[PDB]
Amino acid sequence: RPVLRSVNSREPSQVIFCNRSPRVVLPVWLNFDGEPQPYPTLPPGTGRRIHSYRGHLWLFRDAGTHDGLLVNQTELFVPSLNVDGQPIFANITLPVYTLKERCLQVVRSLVKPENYRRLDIVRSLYEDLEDHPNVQKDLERLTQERIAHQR
């Protein structure tokens, strides 16, 4: 029913997750009801073989902050089948964050949420700091992006 969900193809597809970011990465699998499920994390510069399936949807996040990362230069990874026996690579990288978002990341990394509103900054930035990245926000945006260019 949710458009962004894995399909139960039951068709094995071997993938290699390759973390080419400086972040500890959390692979996130969107299950058949479109709910996110975590898998074990990947240290920077580490690769790992995974047994996945045709049509299964994956996202990748900073394991500690949930910032979004790219996989093969886009936000969603969906394997097809292994071509002539070769593993499918999912190359995970850092996006070029806006300077504002990167600043929000660094301030969130240094200040407890309960203290955001004690910071002496333009007050619109309080809600910006509190609007933490998260998978469901991105799923909403990605879904309406999909229907928008679908029409």
Binding site: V96, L99, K100, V106, V107, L119, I121
Partner: protein, 97 residues
């Protein structure tokens, strides 16, 4: 090739490529364009509330953004020291970049 001048609140002058400075939506909006006022060339912007230690960091962000956007090269982290983080956030929010 073409450069623009960005002036900090404490009077430092930063000379940066125009393409790089157009990374900021605010700067782009204050500089002449090919459509808007090409004859009336505006090559300079003054920042009354952004000091030189922040504006220099912003210029470094322009360079990073242009270098690593739509590129094959592996992307490194943009580093931000704690002591500058809040002012840099205010400047990024003001400058729309």
């Amino acid at each position: 090739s073409m450069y623009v001048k960005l002036i900090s609140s404490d009077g430092h002058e930063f000379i940066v490529k125009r393409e790089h400075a157009l990374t900021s939506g605010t700067i782009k909006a204050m500089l002449s364009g090919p459509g808007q006022f090409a004859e009336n060339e505006t090559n300079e912007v003054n920042f009354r509330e952004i000091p030189s230690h922040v504006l220099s960091k912003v210029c470094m962000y322009f360079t990073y953004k242009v270098r690593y956007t739509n590129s094959s090269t592996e992307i490194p982290e943009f580093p931000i020291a704690p002591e500058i983080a809040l002012e840099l956030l205010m400047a990024a929010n003001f400058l729309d970049c």
